[PDB]
Design a protein around this nucleic acid. Structure first.
Ligand SMILES: [Mg+2]
Ligand SMILES: [Mg+2]
Ligand SMILES: [Mg+2]
Ligand SMILES: [Mg+2]
Ligand SMILES: [Mg+2]
Ligand SMILES: [Mg+2]
Ligand SMILES: [Mg+2]
Ligand SMILES: [Mg+2]
Ligand SMILES: [Mg+2]
Ligand SMILES: [Mg+2]
Ligand SMILES: [Mg+2]
Ligand SMILES: [Mg+2]
Ligand SMILES: [Mg+2]
Ligand SMILES: [Mg+2]
Ligand SMILES: [Mg+2]
Ligand SMILES: [Mg+2]
Ligand SMILES: [Mg+2]
Ligand SMILES: [Mg+2]
Ligand SMILES: [Mg+2]
Ligand SMILES: [Mg+2]
Ligand SMILES: [Zn+2]
Lengths: 145, 103, 82, 141, 167, 100, 53, 143, 63
RNA sequence: UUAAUUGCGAUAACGAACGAGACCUUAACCUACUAAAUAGUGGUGCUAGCAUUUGCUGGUUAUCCACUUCUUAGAGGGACUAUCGGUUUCAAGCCGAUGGAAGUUUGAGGCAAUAACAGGUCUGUGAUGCCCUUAGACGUUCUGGGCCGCACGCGCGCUACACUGACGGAGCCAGCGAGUCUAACCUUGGCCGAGAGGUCUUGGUAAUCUUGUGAAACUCCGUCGUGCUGGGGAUAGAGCAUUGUAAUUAUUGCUCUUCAACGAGGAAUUCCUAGUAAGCGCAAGUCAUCAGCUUGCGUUGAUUACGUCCCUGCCCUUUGUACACAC
């Protein structure tokens, strides 16, 4: 029932983490556009940054969004339970990270080339392009590429 | 709220408006299957009216913001008036035209 | 990969998500003369979102411009108050 | 003692026992009044017997219903059959049979299944198919 | 300390096992079934055969060794399991006795028609309503075929088959 | 003395005549008793394929075994209890007595 | 040698076998009878299972 | 006349009691709230994130008022649902045990529910009296 | 269909041959004397025979 | 005429038999019998809350008393197309209505003839003839693989392609069943853990305990909003657990992230007439662990016929045949 006439400060797009985050949709589902940021992570970040999750993304302040990306790129510093993290207990650094927009692809390629250079079975499977999780490949995934 | 008479009066005169009076059947004839125009029983008139109305409401409410209730409402209203924009009315005149051609 | 279908494109509508003064006083002036008012009616006649339609419905029935007939979820039925 | 009967309504698997005694006119179901039976349209469907025979015949009698089994609408049908059978049984035992037979006439004129339980029962599932009749699928080539 | 379901299927498989055992060794004694009665202080096994002197042996030696065998196999206490023999009546009205007599006649080398007609004549003389014996397999040729020998009338469908027909 | 007799058989008329001669002996001795409470018959079902091999029509077969259970509660001294468990031995019917 | 037949048979189909025919496939482990389905079909009448419906 | 929880509808009663509990503010919310999904079969956290714990508390309070005694497993089965298991068919999955256990401990702390013989939690007389008073208030709203 | 077999028809007409003055035009009394006067394994078969005897008595009353 | 060589009848046939039917099981009815703290109900005590003016909603095992309506069974009864009206040589029967719990042989099954297939199975069988092998064995056992391997083609299915909707809160209802002894089964409750799960105990050899299996679909409030979108959840990466001797070609489960085709499906083609189709989940089977499978159960519950021989076939009679491994 609470209507408010918005002003000209709305922006139909906004730019976060080298990704063209769409405006005109609610902020948590808009932040899911960032690759590496899903619904749970985006919802918890919008909660920890103390933004109104009912607000649209295109009408949000610069300080609110930079607080959001700070909480994103430094997750555990703001009381994040460290099992939400998609890259936890990594193989070299040993500490829990959370990869983001292009670091997800780069780190995926890093573990793939690690497996390929140690000639592990999953690495050879990925190099051939076959299924690696032990699925049957006789009938499904015919036009997988 | 629209058409402030009895809404059940609207649905009964809708099914009388969209009841198909004559319809065609599929006879063999030899090789080429033919159409033959026969008349429709009143029970099948009611049944075909109900099926046409709800099918039109369903396919018009599919994949859009208009709910099935209000879609069925406007379909029933247009059928009760007689409008040629109702799905059931269009199907009715098509079936009666094919019957009249294959008399 | 054969399809056996057409899959023709559509209009890709651009319903409004935030309101301004012109849309606000537009709805304030033309939600009367609507005999039957609902979320989809507002969406089709004003090109606004469903969220704006719901909030505007609650607003107008709170002040009293539209009368509720049935306020069920997923289907709200409002008339004009005369 | 107190004038009191107990009857029962049934459905597919829902049963509803109804104790009808003399009281001040309270119609409870599972300790809750009849206005809260929670399909809220079948609320009207369970209102309809007492709405038919008028609330004057419920002023001096109170009904308490305990319902088990089935689903929601099955329980509602069991409730309405139970209260109809309880009212007509009270009017059979204590009141004369004229009231009993006109009440039963009104009930069965509106709906047969208000007093007579429906005899449709689940048909067992046969092998070679998911249901009682439907088979799986015939493939030839 | 066993559930009743498992107890009842246990005595079922126990009866079936000892019946298979008895029809394996007591074939040349006309073994025509067995019955069990569990009882406070003892369980008894009533064998119903024809040659009771042969299933007993000299002074019950074969009954003694059979009791010892079933006791050793089923881990019963010595004395808690007892066996009795019984000369069964109506030998013609017993499908297994006629079947094993047919088997022994054919193993001795009798003709199949003579043996089957003799046994069906014996059963019909024994007061049966109808008897019916089928011999299947390779008879005089590599190609197999089933021969049928019947007398009287027999039924095939219904609860009367469980009630009356012994097979 | 609070004894319970439980019959756990499959032959229903054998169990029934056992229970009837039990209760008429009990009322002949004018003993107090909760009568024969008949528990729900429990059906043991086993569904299999009829064929030993795999081919044919997928025809299934359900072999069942009904189990009937009754219990009678008695208050009666040890000597009439001992002749009660001495007697009522039926073939194919399993009985057991518990005290307290 | 001791190693011969060393492998555990505490579970799986190698732990069970038909009490009548020593078959591993098709076991009926219901109610602890442990008969293959074919031998059960033969012996069900004298076990005490019957067909009523 | 006298009323009870059975004399009022469940939804508005739970709404009123949850609002009263949020206004009272002596419930001892856990702290890991606003992080969880309430069910392994769910896929999103509750949408009323600042609330929903007073709602769950009111619901289990009414549930224990109705029943004799319940446990956290009974509550997990009650609040569990159909988990969309991706491409495989659905299945019932019990809810989060920690949420129900901590709200039960919190209701013990505030004094609505108590521990019970025969195991579980039973509605105490204090919880009974104030649930009845809240029912009185929530059906006398409309007068 | 409700066609009755020759066992029912033959037992019914035999009952009518040797018990015509005893039995009457009511199914209940015909049943209550049929179970007394013959041994039938089935209540269903007894009811079928009694119904056909009552039908044939109705036939006898008209020619 | 019947669902039916089911019957009425006709009659070089008469009298019979098997099959069908009859039969048995199950589902429906019984306020009629027997009963029952291992099923309930009412009252009485003791006790909680509100109203207090009697009351309403509850709890209570050694508080008893009473009963069996609901629940379980056992013994029976009940329907036979009963009555009536039509129609039929006016017979078998058929149609409609009334009554009735039930009027499609009441519904669903089980059993189910003769003759055969050169159907399948020697990988169920210490059922087997013959042939092969029988000791660096084709026996048996151990280690490790494989039965999953993927350019492709088909058959059962499961998820879906969205607002008759997804998600989040509440509301909140089944039935069929299974479960540990010399073993370690179904697990309640308490606590820890986001979760999966773990730990301390407890009940149950079971109408008693798991379990009212508080199932899901559903309902009500909201959020979303016609956007391959908060649909859809494949393909992947990382981590945490459980089973097991052992999980690497991930056993499964859980968390986060990744977020593809799919916009209702061409020629074709399957199943189905009422509590049936369809939707929805649950139990059991296999099972140390693993359901997208099967066997059953219940929950919600439509539309359209009440016919025809056009297609696909089936039964009987007549007819033609150059067919007999038989179009
Ligand atoms: Mg729509
Ligand atoms: Mg189904
Ligand atoms: Mg829920
Ligand atoms: Mg689905
Ligand atoms: Mg009391
Ligand atoms: Mg007549
Ligand atoms: Mg039948
Ligand atoms: Mg073989
Ligand atoms: Mg394979
Ligand atoms: Mg198949
Ligand atoms: Mg929902
Ligand atoms: Mg139950
Ligand atoms: Mg989704
Ligand atoms: Mg076909
Ligand atoms: Mg399983
Ligand atoms: Mg496996
Ligand atoms: Mg399988
Ligand atoms: Mg010719
Ligand atoms: Mg020739
Ligand atoms: Mg040709
Ligand atoms: Zn075997």
């Amino acid at each position: 029932s609470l209507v408010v006439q918005e002003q000209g400060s709305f922006q139909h797009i906004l730019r976060l983490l080298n990704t063209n985050v769409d405006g005109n949709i609610k902020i948590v589902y808009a932040l899911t556009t960032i690759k590496g940021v899903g619904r749970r992570y985006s919802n918890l970040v919008c909660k920890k940054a103390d933004v109104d999750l009912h607000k649209r993304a295109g009408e949000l302040t610069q300080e609110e969004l930079e607080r959001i990306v700070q909480i994103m790129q430094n997750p555990t510093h703001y009381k994040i339970p460290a099992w939400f993290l998609n890259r936890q207990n990594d193989i070299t650094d040993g500490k829990d990270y959370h990869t983001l927009a292009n670091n997800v692809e780069s780190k995926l390629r890093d573990d793939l080339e690690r497996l390929k250079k140690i000639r592990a079975h999953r690495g050879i499977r990925h190099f051939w392009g076959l299924r690696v999780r032990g699925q049957h490949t006789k009938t499904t995934g015919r036009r997988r590429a | 709220v629209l058409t402030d008479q009895n809404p059940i009066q609207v649905v009964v005169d809708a099914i009388t408006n969209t009841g198909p009076r004559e319809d065609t059947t599929r006879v063999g004839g030899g090789g080429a299957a033919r159409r033959q125009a026969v008349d429709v029983s009143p029970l099948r008139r009611v049944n075909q009216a109900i099926a046409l109305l709800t099918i039109g409401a369903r396919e018009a409410a599919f994949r859009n913001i208009k709910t099935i209730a209000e879609t069925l409402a406007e379909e029933l209203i247009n059928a009760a008036k007689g409008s040629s924009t109702s799905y059931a009315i269009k199907k009715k005149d098509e079936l009666e035209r094919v019957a009249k051609s294959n008399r | 990969k054969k399809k056996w279908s057409k899959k023709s494109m559509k209009d890709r509508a651009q319903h409004a998500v935030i309101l301004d003064q012109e849309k606000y006083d537009r709805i304030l002036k033309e939600v009367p003369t609507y005999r039957y008012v609902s979320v989809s009616v507002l969406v089709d006649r004003l090109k606004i979102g469903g969220s704006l339609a719901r909030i505007a419905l609650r607003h107008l029935e709170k002040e009293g411009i539209i009368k509720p007939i049935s306020k069920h979820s997923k289907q709200a039925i409002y008339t004009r108050a005369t | 003692a107190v004038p009191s009967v107990q009857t029962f309504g049934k459905k597919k698997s829902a049963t509803a026992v109804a104790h009808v005694k003399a009281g001040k006119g309270l119609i409870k179901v599972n300790g809750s009044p009849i206005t809260l039976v929670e399909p809220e349209i079948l609320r009207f469907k369970v209102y309809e017997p007492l709405l038919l025979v008028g609330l004057d015949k419920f002023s001096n009698i109170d009904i308490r219903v305990r319902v088990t089994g089935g689903g929601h609408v099955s329980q509602v049908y069991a409730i309405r059959q139970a209260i109809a059978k309880g009212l007509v049984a009270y009017h059979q035992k204590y009141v004369d049979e004229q009231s009993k037979n006109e009440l039963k006439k009104a009930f069965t004129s509106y709906d047969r299944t208000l007093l007579i339980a429906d005899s449709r029962r689940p048909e067992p599932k046969k092998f070679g198919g998911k249901g009682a009749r439907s088979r799986f699928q015939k493939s030839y080539r | 300390l066993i559930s009743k379901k498992r107890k009842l299927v246990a005595d079922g498989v126990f009866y079936a096992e000892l019946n298979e055992f008895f029809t394996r060794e007591l074939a040349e004694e006309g073994y025509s079934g067995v019955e069990v009665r569990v009882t406070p202080t003892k369980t008894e096994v009533i064998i119903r055969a024809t040659r009771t002197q042969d299933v007993l042996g000299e002074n019950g030696r074969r009954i003694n060794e059979l009791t010892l065998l079933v006791q050793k196999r089923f881990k019963y206490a010595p004395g808690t399991i007892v066996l009795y023999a019984e000369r069964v009546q109506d030998r013609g009205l017993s499908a297994v006795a006629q079947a094993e007599s047919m088997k022994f006649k054919l193993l001795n080398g009798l003709a199949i028609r003579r043996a089957a007609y003799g046994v069906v004549r014996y059963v019909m003389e024994s007061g049966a309503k109808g008897c019916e014996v089928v011999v299947s397999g390779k008879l005089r040729a590599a190609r197999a075929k089933a021969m049928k020998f019947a007398d009287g009338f027999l039924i095939h469908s219904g609860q009367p088959v469980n009630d009356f027909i012994d097979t | 003395i609070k004894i319970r007799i439980t019959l756990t058989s499959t032959k229903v008329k054998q169990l029934e005549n056992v229970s009837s001669n039990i209760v008429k002996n009990a009322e002949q001795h004018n003993l107090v008793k909760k009568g024969p409470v008949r528990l729900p018959t429990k059906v043991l079902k086993i569904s299999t394929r009829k064929t030993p091999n795999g081919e044919g029509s997928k025809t299934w077969e359900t072999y069942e075994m009904r189990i009937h259970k009754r219990y009678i509660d008695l208050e009666a001294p040890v000597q009439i209890v001992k002749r009660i468990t001495q007697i009522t031995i039926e073939p194919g019917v399993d009985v057991e007595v518990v005290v307290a | 040698e001791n190693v011969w037949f060393s492998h555990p048979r505490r579970y799986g189909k190698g732990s069970r076998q038909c009490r009548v025919c020593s078959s591993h496939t098709g076991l009926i482990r219901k109610y602890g009878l442990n008969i293959c389905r074919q031998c059960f079909r033969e012996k069900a009448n004298d076990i005490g299972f019957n067909k009523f419906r | 006349p006298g009323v009870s929880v059975r004399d009022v509808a469940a939804q508005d009663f739970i709404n009123a009691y949850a609002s009263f509990l949020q206004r009272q503010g002596k419930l001892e919310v856990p702290g890991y709230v606003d992080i969880v999904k309430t069910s392994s079969g769910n896929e999103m956290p509750p949408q009323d994130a600042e609330g929903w714990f007073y709602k769950r508390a009111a619901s289990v309070a009414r549930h224990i008022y109705m029943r004799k005694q319940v446990g956290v497993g009974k509550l997990n089965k009650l609040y569990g649902g159909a988990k969309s298991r991706g491409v495989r068919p659905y299945k019932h999955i019990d809810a989060s045990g920690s949420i129900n256990r901590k709200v039960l401990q919190a209701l013990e702390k505030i004094g609505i529910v108590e521990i019970s013989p025969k195991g579980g939690r039973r509605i105490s007389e204090n919880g009974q009296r104030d649930l009845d008073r809240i029912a009185a208030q929530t059906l006398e709203e409309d007068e | 269909g409700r066609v009755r077999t020759k066992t029912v028809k033959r037992a019914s007409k035999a009952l009518i041959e040797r018990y015509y003055p005893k039995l009457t035009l009511d199914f209940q009394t015909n049943k209550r004397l049929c179970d007394e006067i013959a041994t039938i394994q089935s209540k269903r078969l007894r009811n079928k025979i009694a119904g056909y005897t009552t039908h044939l008595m109705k036939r006898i009353q008209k020619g």
